[PDB]
């Protein structure tokens, strides 16, 4: 079977807000599979979210990022008048600094050709043939990606912090996100086990599927 694609990520700042963290901007320690899937769709310029259902992603943390809080005068739709003072609320947002990680992309379970792995490989092969809009980012639109590149299993040849699907794990990362409410959001429990093991273990793979 074709070897899974490997991407090296380096984002100076990230915000993977929690699904239930609406009063305060609490962030996940590791990018959720849904956020990575959306980033890959943006990278290949695919607006439809159901197009690449079935792709499996594995995330390996190259280092533990530090969590910091920043104040922000975030806006909201509370009053009909745009200039009303009620539309601006001060709230904290937790960010992660100097995030480096390796992303494994495996597209065996996709039923629509070309697969996401092939699309990413073709986009990296001929960047001038990619038809997309906006700037690539991970998390919030202002959090641009510093380095995204094709890498091998030993890009830093160091020790890797894998995200393992453990039913007793701490983190509850979503692989599908409902941006309106929380009905269609689907969750999975993960843990961060320290293990170089260059290649992802079997439990480190998460398949992105529709909530149906």
């Amino acid at each position: 079977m074709i070897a899974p694609l490997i991407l090296y990520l380096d984002v100076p700042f990230t915000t993977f807000r929690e699904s239930h963290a609406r009063e305060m901007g609490k962030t996940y320690p590791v990018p959720p599979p849904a956020t990575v899937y959306g980033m890959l769709l943006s990278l290949v310029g695919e607006t439809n979210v159901y197009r690449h259902c079935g792709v499996e992603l594995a995330i390996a943390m190259l280092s533990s990022p530090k969590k910091s809080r920043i104040l922000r005068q975030m806006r909201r739709f509370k009053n009909a008048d745009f200039s009303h003072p009620e539309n601006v609320i001060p709230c904290y947002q937790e960010i992660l600094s100097n995030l480096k990680c390796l992303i494994w992309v495996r597209s065996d379970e996709e039923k629509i050709q070309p697969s996401l792995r092939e699309r990413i490989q073709l986009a990296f092969d001929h960047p001038e043939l990619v038809r997309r809009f906006g700037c690539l980012f991970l998390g919030e639109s202002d959090q641009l990606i510093k380095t995204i590149k094709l890498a091998r299993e030993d890009y830093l040849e160091g020790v890797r912090q894998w995200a393992i699907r453990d039913n007793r794990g701490r983190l509850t990362l979503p692989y599908w996100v409902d941006h309106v409410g929380s009905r269609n959001t689907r969750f999975l429990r993960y843990r961060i086990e320290e293990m170089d093991r260059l290649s992802p273990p079997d439990l480190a793979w998460t398949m992105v599927q529709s909530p149906i």
Binding site: H20, E23, F77, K78, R165, N167, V180, L188
Partner: protein, 494 residues
């Protein structure tokens, strides 16, 4: 038969709040089973099967009747109007701690009058040290936890809903509707069983009061609330931990550091040498944005992971450092917290040295030697912490050198000043602290410290450790040396 509601810690779709809610439901079910041994006594013949990590509920007839019975028995109100959670052993807990828990729940979960109907302001005067202090709390007549059973079941068929239930911030902390103009749609939705778990959440979580040291305790009473939400490893373990935490005095729940609060949740835990101890919890800070704020707002969430060493160090700190003072004025119990304990607990939580931020938090931010005077009261705790330090004995050698130098410097003037003219240790120590505060960079501080060491006369400790202490002074940052000089002043034995 087939359980109508099944809850497990192993479910992949649960978060920390969901697991805390299942733990609270487990505790409430244990207490109810003790209260109602026979299932026929319970309304709707509701029965449960509780395991280490699973909860299953069986009942007969209409779901609404059984759920209403369970919820009404779980959340109650006594004659005085306080929140009566049968999950907690309310006989064992005293009136003051019950009032504390009720106020914490009303200020954190029931922030909004839309979810509680308030009664009269009940005033009670309980005597304490031959003084009757009047506690004044807002009694309640109803809260949404009591009647959420209607929201759990369908209006017409009176059966458990088969769809998601839209919840609000009173159920899930932080589950705010960001855009008020989209109140119908942009609302967090949960399954009915997880809604029941979120209903039972408040039983397990514990509430601590945060004291800001910049403002004087007398000049303003505390209002910031800290919610300690533990990470559940087992229903029995967390239940035992909460029922053990029921032992703590109300004055211990006032902290100045989240670390303290967090560690305080696990302070009573027994450490087993053969078992690898590991616990985690989250501390949520609720604070009014402005003075005229109607309700508290979630400001920060801090995750605390504690191991065996951290728990042992915090237990030693609690045992040896001064406890919280209970200053009692007119109809008000002002609980004076220990800043040293809070700072050490925060430093332990952050994984840094226990003396990391002693200077700018003890001398710089001290108004009238209020924090400075507590150093000589916590001298014994300082000595214990230095002696039982996990590493860095070279700086303890430096402590000995500086204490010898201080002895020499003080003895010079004390020999110069005759009886009656001899000033107390307080004035000389204050002058030394001011001179240490004078230093602004490495050169000035090292010059002053070296001159002080020379003026201290012969220093045997320096002589025995010439190379080590010399290298330590030359290489170490001057701020760390100043902090260690401060805590050597604190632990100075005349």
């Amino acid at each position: 038969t087939q359980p109508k509601i099944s809850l497990s810690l192993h479910a992949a779709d649960t978060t920390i709040m969901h697991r805390v809610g299942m733990t609270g439901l487990y505790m409430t079910l244990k207490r109810l089973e003790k209260q109602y041994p026979l299932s026929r006594q319970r309304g709707g013949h509701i029965s449960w099967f509780l395991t280490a990590d699973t909860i299953e509920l069986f009942w007969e007839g209409s779901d609404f009747i059984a759920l209403s019975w369970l919820i009404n028995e779980s959340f109650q109100l006594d004659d005085t109007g306080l929140i009566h959670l049968v999950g907690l052993d309310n006989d064992r807990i005293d009136l003051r701690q019950k009032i504390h828990i009720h106020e914490g729940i009303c200020g954190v979960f029931l922030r909004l009058n839309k979810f509680y109907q308030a009664g009269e302001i009940i005033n009670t005067e309980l005597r304490f040290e031959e003084k009757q202090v009047e506690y004044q709390y807002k009694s309640l007549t109803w809260y949404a936890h009591q009647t959420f059973a209607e929201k759990l079941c369908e209006a017409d068929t009176q059966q458990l809903r088969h769809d998601y239930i839209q919840i609000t911030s009173w159920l899930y902390l932080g589950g705010i509707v960001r855009h008020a103009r989209t109140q119908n749609t942009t609302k967090l939705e949960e399954k009915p069983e997880y809604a029941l778990a979120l209903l039972f959440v408040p039983v397990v979580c514990h509430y601590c009061l945060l004291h800001i040291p910049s403002e004087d305790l007398k000049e303003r009473k505390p209002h910031r609330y800290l919610v300690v939400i533990p990470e559940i490893k087992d229903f029995e373990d967390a239940s035992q931990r909460r029922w053990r935490l029921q032992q703590l005095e109300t004055k211990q729940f006032h902290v100045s550091s989240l670390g303290e609060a967090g560690l305080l949740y696990y302070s009573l835990d027994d450490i087993q040498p053969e078992v690898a101890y590991y616990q985690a919890c989250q501390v949520w800070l609720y604070e009014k944005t402005n003075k005229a704020s109607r309700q508290r707002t979630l400001m920060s969430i801090e995750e605390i992971k504690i191991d065996k060493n951290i728990l042992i160090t915090y237990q030693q700190v609690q045992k040896y450092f001064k406890t919280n003072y209970q200053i009692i004025k007119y109809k008000q119990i002002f609980i004076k917290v220990n800043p040293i304990r809070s700072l050490i607990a925060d430093n332990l939580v952050k994984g840094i040295h226990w003396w990391s931020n002693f200077w700018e938090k003890l001398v710089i931010e001290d108004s009238k030697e209020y924090l400075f005077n507590q150093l000589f009261s916590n001298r014994e705790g300082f000595i214990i912490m230095a002696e039982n330090s996990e590493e860095d004995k070279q700086y303890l050698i430096f402590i000995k050198v500086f204490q010898q130098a201080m002895k020499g410097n003080f003895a010079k003037i004390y020999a110069k000043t005759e009886e009656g003219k001899d000033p107390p240790i307080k004035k000389k120590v204050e002058r030394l602290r001011a001179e240490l505060n004078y230093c602004y960079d490495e050169l000035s501080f090292k010059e002053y410290l070296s001159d002080f060491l020379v003026r201290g006369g012969l220093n045997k400790y320096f002589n025995e450790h010439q190379e080590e202490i010399a290298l330590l002074i030359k290489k170490s940052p001057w701020q760390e040396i100043r902090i260690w000089s401060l805590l050597a002043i604190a632990s100075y034995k005349p």
